[PDB]
Amino acid sequence: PQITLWKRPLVTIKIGGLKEALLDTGADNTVIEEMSLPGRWKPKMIGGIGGFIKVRQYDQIIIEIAGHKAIGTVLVGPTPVNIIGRNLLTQIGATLNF
Amino acid sequence: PQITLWKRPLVTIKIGGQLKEALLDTGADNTVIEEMSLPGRWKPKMIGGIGGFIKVRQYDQIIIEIAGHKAIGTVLVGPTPVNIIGRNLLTQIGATLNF
Numbered sequence: 300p301q302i303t304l305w306k307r308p309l310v311t312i313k314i315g316g317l318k319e320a321l322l323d324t325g326a327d328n329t330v331i332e333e334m335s336l337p338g339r340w341k342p343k344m345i346g347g348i349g350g351f352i353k354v355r356q357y358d359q360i361i362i363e364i365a366g367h368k369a370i371g372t373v374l375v376g377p378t379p380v381n382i383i384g385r386n387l388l389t390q391i392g393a394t395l396n397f
Numbered sequence: 398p399q400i401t402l403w404k405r406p407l408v409t410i411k412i413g414g415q416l417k418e419a420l421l422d423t424g425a426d427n428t429v430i431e432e433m434s435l436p437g438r439w440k441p442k443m444i445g446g447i448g449g450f451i452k453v454r455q456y457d458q459i460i461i462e463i464a465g466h467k468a469i470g471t472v473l474v475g476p477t478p479v480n481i482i483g484r485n486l487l488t489q490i491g492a493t494l495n496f
C-alpha cells in the first residue's frame with residue numbers, strides 16, 4: 300500500500316495470537332504494550348522524549364504487520380503506543396518516498 | 398528519493414541559515430528540534446513521548462529546508478534526544494510510506 304501521513308500511520312498487527320500499532324521510521328526497534336510472549340527474554344532500557352522505560356526483550360518473534368509476516372526482536376513494556384520500528388519495517392519492504 | 402530503513406533515515410535540514418542533522422520520523426506527530434534561537438513569539442505545548450509528557454516551545458510558520466525540500470511550518474524546541482521531522486512537515490514535502 301501507499302500510506303499518507305495526514306494522520307498517524309496505524310495498522311493492525313497480529314502478535315502472540317490483534318493490536319493496533321504505529322509504523323514508525325523514527326524507532327530502531329519494535330515496542331509493544333504489556334503482553335505475554337513465549338520463550339526467553341532479557342531486560343533492556345529504552346529512552347526518548349520524556350526519558351527511559353524498562354522493557355523485556357524477546358528475540359525471534361513472528362508478527363503479521365498489515366498482512367505481511369516478519370520475524371525479529373520485540374520489546375515489551377509500558378509504552379504509550381504500540382510501535383513497529385525499523386527492525387521489522389525493513390522485513391516487509393517498507394520505504395519512505397518523496 | 399526512496400529511502401530504505403536498514404539505517405536510520407537521517408537527512409540534513411537547514412533552519413535559521415544553519416545545517417543540522419534530523420531523523421525522518423513517521424511516528425512523530427510534530428517536528429521537535431534541539432535548543433536553538435528562532436524568531437517571533439512562541440506558545441506552550443505538551444507532548445507525550447516514550448518516557449512521559451514534557452513541555453516544549455512552539456514556533457509557527459518557520460522556514461525550514463528538509464533534504465533540499467522547502468517547507469514552512471511549526472517547529473517545537475525542547476529536550477529531544479535527536480532532531481525529529483514529524484508528520485506536520487513530512488506531509489509538506491510529500492512523503493508517504495510504501496510497502
Ligand SMILES: CC(C)CN(C[C@@H](O)[C@H](Cc1ccccc1)NC(=O)O[C@H]1CO[C@H]2OCC[C@H]21)S(=O)(=O)c1ccc2c(c1)C(=O)O[B-]2(O)O
Pocket residue numbers: 323324325326327328329330344345346347348374379380382384420422423424425426427428429444445446447448478479481483
Ligand atoms: C524520539 C525518537 C528518536 C525515538 N522514538 C520513536 C518516535 O517515533 C516516538 C514514537 C512514540 C509515539 C507516540 C508516543 C510515544 C512514542 N515518537 C515521538 O516521540 O514523537 C513526539 C514527537 O511528536 C509527538 O507525537 C508522538 C509523540 C510526540 S522512541 O519511541 O522514543 C524509541 C523507540 C524505540 C527505541 C528507542 C526509543 C530506544 O532508545 O531504543 B529503541 O528500542 O530502539
Ligand SMILES: [Cl-]
Pocket residue numbers: 370371372386387
Ligand atoms: Cl530484529
Ligand SMILES: [Cl-]
Pocket residue numbers: 392401
Ligand atoms: Cl530492501
Ligand SMILES: [Cl-]
Pocket residue numbers: 469470471485486
Ligand atoms: Cl505545520
